[PDB]
């Protein structure tokens, strides 16, 4: 075992983790969505996985 916790300004590391995880999440979510906006009269007759 190994344990000796910092303080309860652990929150001041939890706060910056929330910021860092929010940037990572919002960035890759926004490009997770962005390649589907158009879809253009979806598969009328045409064999394309749009």
């Amino acid at each position: 075992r190994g344990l000796n916790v910092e303080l309860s300004k652990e929150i001041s590391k939890r706060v910056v983790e929330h910021r860092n995880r929010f940037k990572r999440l919002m960035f890759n979510r926004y490009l997770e969505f962005l390649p589907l906006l158009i879809n253009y009269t979806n598969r009328d007759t045409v064999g394309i996985d749009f």
Binding site: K23, R24, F27, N28, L31, L34, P35
Partner: protein
Amino acid sequence: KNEELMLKRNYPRMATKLYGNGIVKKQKFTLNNNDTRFNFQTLADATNYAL
């Protein structure tokens, strides 16, 4: 030579080789969603990077 040599047997002889197992080989990769977006200033080039 004597006539009872007809009773004496002669087996065909064998020449073999055993091989056994091969190798399972693997190869992995680990693609990210934040640190690669510090680089790669266009998103489409990140998708091209991915494939």
